[PDB]
Write a protein that binds this ligand. Structure first.
Ligand SMILES: OC[C@H]1O[C@@H]2O[C@H]3[C@H](O)[C@@H](O)[C@@H](O[C@H]4[C@H](O)[C@@H](O)[C@@H](O[C@H]5[C@H](O)[C@@H](O)[C@@H](O[C@H]6[C@H](O)[C@@H](O)[C@@H](O[C@H]7[C@H](O)[C@@H](O)[C@@H](O[C@H]8[C@H](O)[C@@H](O)[C@@H](O[C@H]1[C@H](O)[C@H]2O)O[C@@H]8CO)O[C@@H]7CO)O[C@@H]6CO)O[C@@H]5CO)O[C@@H]4CO)O[C@@H]3CO
Length: 476
């Protein structure tokens, strides 16, 4: 009797490329590509387990542009420059970026602490600020190759900075190929999402927010977004076919968000399986185990992720020692294994690139120990999405209705329902009436609405500039 364990690591970045200047206004795609997007599937080269991945199409587009040397990244241009050529504005944003990240374990260099305590910075100190910001985002693969330079910690030269940059782009250039390779080798399945990571249930029926939050105020949805919902899915299918050679049969719904209408749409578009959140299951079915494969109306398979296990990784274990965390995780899996007489399917689903920067050494001690330990347990069988979908010795249940929501509390309050977020929807509604091109789809991405109307943080205004620029461009 085995426990079937399914990791599904979700990778996404909204579009940082401002459409009038063509500049990437934030470097986060670059930094998560060099730190996470290659290295997360590259674990499969060293560990005999299965791991699965979601790549949003808008993320794939940006990885392609960086890989081809086409991305004009303003923050990265400031890193590349000789410090004598840095504008005051660029130094300021290098310092602000450092302060934003200063407390993360991946920024644990004594030299950073020295440079932040300094009133003015000379050329050598600026070179160190530039290069340490690069090295802070070093992924697992190059932490081996660049060991000598990482241990230096200070006194970097322009030549060493450029060496690091060249290696980082070599990683980005190999990234889509490793996803293709692990898929073809049967080491993992790869899914995608509707193109720009929108909330499909809201685009199909904005009144679905009242299934969970009856008291919320929403704007007057005087335009239909239903066709746009279909387009996000269809264009995702096309992009996925380009990279992987088939239409995708697995999708991750952005924010785990489902509704009866959204599930019907995924079925109509040929998606055979998706996953969503356990809170949605508990809101929809009184007596329900998350260890079963569910069939929504016998149209499409649904797995509900194990929220506690997913949250152990996403929220707890950064604060723990790696060995303690792995022993805890295996212990919980063993209790699950001993708790049912059938073979349970245990989905572990979370962002695949955001939690590691808060772990010691970018979470590499944790993941190496986790995967090493998993591959040794006879009673754990990790599965690809494809195996989880077709596995016969699993228990199964039909469900006829779900209560619309997301993996935030089972509701939509992070993206709609307060004055500020509603203003974004009103902007989008008005723009949609006058829309002339697919930039209106870019502006439907969930990310813009998440950041809007949130307590001020460094670089928040950049998401607002992006959103409004896409809205403007949509109408021209
Ligand atoms: O939009 C840019 C963003 O896009 C991607 O992220 C999206 C992701 O793909 C979706 O799945 C979804 O993610 C949900 C997530 O899975 C849930 O876990 C939850 O996330 C909440 C966190 O759990 C919770 O801890 C908290 O996070 C707070 C941090 O703990 C706190 O440290 C601080 O974080 C600041 C960062 O330290 C700083 O670096 C900067 O963050 C930038 C990112 O580093 C950068 O990569 C990018 O983010 C991408 C992301 O990588 C994609 O995968 O831009 C960020 C902004 O510049 O600034 C942070 C804020 O100051 O504060 C955070 C927030 O309070 O809250 C989060 C969010 O509630 O919910 C997610 C939403 O359901 O959505 C995300 C976003 O669209």
């Amino acid at each position: 009797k085995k426990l079937f364990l399914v990791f599904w690591w979700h990778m996404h970045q909204p579009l940082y490329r401002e459409p009038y200047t063509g500049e990437y206004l934030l470097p986060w795609t670059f930094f998560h590509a060099v730190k996470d997007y290659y290295d997360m599937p590259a674990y499969l080269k060293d560990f005999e387990i299965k791991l699965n991945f979601n790549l949003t199409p808008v993320l794939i587009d940006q990885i392609q542009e960086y890989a081809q040397g086409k991305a004009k990244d303003v923050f990265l241009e400031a890193i590349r420059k000789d410090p004598d050529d840095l504008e005051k504005e660029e130094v300021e944003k290098l310092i602000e970026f450092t302060k934003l990240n200063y407390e993360k374990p991946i920024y644990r260099f004594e030299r950073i602490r020295e440079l932040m305590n300094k009133e003015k910075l000379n050329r050598e100190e600026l070179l160190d600020l530039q290069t340490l910001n690069l090295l802070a985002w070093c992924g697992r693969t190059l932490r081996k190759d660049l060991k000598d330079l990482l241990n230096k910690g200070r006194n970097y030269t322009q030549e060493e900075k450029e060496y690091v940059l060249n290696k980082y782009f070599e990683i980005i250039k190999k990234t889509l190929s490793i996803y293709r390779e692990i898929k073809e080798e049967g080491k993992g399945s790869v899914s995608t999402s509707p193109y720009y990571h929108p909330l499909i249930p809201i685009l199909l029926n904005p009144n679905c927010v009242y299934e969970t939050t009856p008291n919320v105020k929403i704007p007057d949805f005087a335009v239909s977004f239903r066709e746009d919902a279909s387009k996000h899915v269809e264009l995702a299918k096309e992009k996925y076919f380009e990279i992987f050679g088939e239409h995708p049969v697995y999708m991750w719904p952005p924010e785990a968000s489902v509704s009866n209408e959204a599930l019907e749409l995924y079925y109509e578009k040929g998606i055979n399986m998706l996953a969503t959140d356990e809170v949605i299951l508990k809101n929809s079915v009184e007596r329900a185990s998350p260890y079963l494969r569910y069939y929504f109306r016998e149209l499409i398979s649904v797995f509900f992720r194990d929220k506690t296990l997913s949250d152990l990784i996403g929220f707890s274990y950064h604060a723990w020692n790696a060995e303690d965390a792995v022993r805890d995780f295996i212990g919980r899996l063993k209790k699950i294994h001993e708790s049912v007489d059938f073979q349970p399917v245990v989905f572990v689903v979370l962002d695949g690139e955001n939690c590691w920067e808060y772990y010691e050494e970018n979470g590499i001690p944790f993941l190496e120990k986790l995967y090493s330990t998993l591959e040794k347990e006879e009673w754990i069988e990790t599965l690809t999405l494809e195996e989880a979908m077709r596995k016969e010795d699993v228990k199964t249940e039909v469900i006829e209705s779900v209560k619309a929501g997301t993996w935030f509390d089972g509701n939509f309050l992070k993206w709609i329902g307060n004055k500020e977020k509603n203003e974004y929807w009103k902007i989008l509604i008005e723009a949609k009436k006058k829309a002339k091109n697919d930039y209106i789809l870019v502006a439907e991405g969930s990310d813009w609405f998440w950041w809007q109307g949130e307590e001020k943080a460094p670089f928040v205004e950049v998401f607002d500039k992006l959103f409004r620029s896409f809205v403007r461009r949509a109408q021209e």
